[PDB]
Ligand binder design. Structure first.
Ligand SMILES: Oc1ccc(F)cc1Nc1nc(-c2ccncc2)cs1
Length: 312
């Protein structure tokens, strides 16, 4: 027996707060959708639910899988995280939030030293998977996705929530690739910041200065460069510890493809100002990116079909 129940977001957050020696079989948590059903107040892997197929990808602090509720047959995603590296922020930051640009959480359930976080599965795959498959993305589609990402950031930032690791691997697409949404709040902060992916990290992060929402903007423009070039910024120019190069080198605007139109290059420049004070906000950048997309003639490229050679 255990303490897994059906309820709302706030009841999950409250319990998650208590998660922060020996290894137990303690089973407890909150399922947020009727599609995931506790059985006699239990929800245990291999008994009531199971993972299958290959991994979906890497999440913060744990692996992500396809899973199925054995009773309802309902399919979703699960990130399994060891209790000692589980951050509460992942289940508190988005409680009471709802946006088309944010992948909804289905709940979380602890099973001894493991915390299983359940989330909607979008069948388009991740933006990171799109890049790998296609080499890189054309300018219009990259702008379109950045726009959508930035809309997600507006929604977060006005609530003083920092996503903390905005990157293609944490953006999910819909089945026709027309919709992108943010996921994985493992590094989220409610405005001590646990830094995300090194290649996407702002100078103020490596400098150890107080971080604000502008960290997400920098990261999102690093993601933009990744979509355009097919690789994370820095990696094609620099060898090892990117920490110091982010802090000391000019911002990676040299990595903007020469083919990009004026306003595309401008937006990326403004999203990549070294001093957060001069860096564009999500509201500002979203507007510029919107103008930028119009000026290249709107979204025209099909989401797949043409492999584009990345930067050598
Ligand atoms: O923080 C989480 C909480 C619950 C989850 F089920 C997943 C995540 N994290 C991530 N999921 C993905 C992903 C999902 C589905 N397909 C491709 C990638 C990338 S990072």
């Amino acid at each position: 027996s255990g303490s897994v129940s059906s309820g709302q977001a706030h009841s999950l957050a409250s319990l998650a707060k208590t998660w922060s020696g020996p290894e137990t079989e303690d089973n407890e948590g909150v399922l947020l959708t009727e599609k995931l059903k506790p059985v006699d107040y239990e929800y245990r892997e291999e008994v009531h639910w199971m993972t299958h197929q290959p991994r979906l990808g890497r999440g913060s602090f744990g692996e992500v899988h396809r899973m199925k509720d054995k009773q309802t047959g309902f399919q979703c995603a699960v990130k399994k995280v060891r209790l000692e590296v589980f951050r509460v922020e992942e289940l508190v930051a988005c409680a009471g939030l709802s946006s088309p640009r944010i992948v909804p959480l289905y709940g979380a359930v602890r099973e001894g030293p493991w915390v299983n976080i359940f989330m909607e599965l979008l069948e388009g795959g991740s933006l990171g998977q799109l890049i790998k498959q296609m080499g890189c993305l054309p300018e219009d589609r990259a702008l379109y996705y950045l726009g959508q990402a930035l809309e997600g950031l507006e929604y977060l930032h006005t609530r003083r929530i920092l996503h903390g690791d905005v990157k293609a691997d944490n953006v999910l697409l819909s089945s026709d690739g027309s919709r992108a949404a943010l996921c994985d709040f493992g590094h989220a902060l409610c405005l001590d910041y646990i830094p995300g992916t090194e290649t996407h990290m702002a100078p103020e992060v490596v400098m150890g200065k107080p971080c604000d929402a502008k960290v997400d903007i920098w990261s999102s423009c690093c993601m933009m460069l990744h979509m355009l070039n097919g690789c994370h910024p820095w990696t094609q120019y620099f060898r090892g510890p990117l920490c110091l190069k982010i802090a000391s080198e000019p911002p990676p605007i040299r990595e903007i493809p020469p083919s990009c139109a004026p306003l595309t290059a401008q937006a990326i420049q403004e999203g990549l100002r070294k001093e957060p004070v001069h860096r564009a906000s999500a509201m500002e950048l979203r507007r510029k990116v919107g103008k930028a997309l119009q000026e290249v003639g709107g979204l025209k490229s099909p989401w797949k079909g043409e492999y584009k050679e990345p930067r050598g």
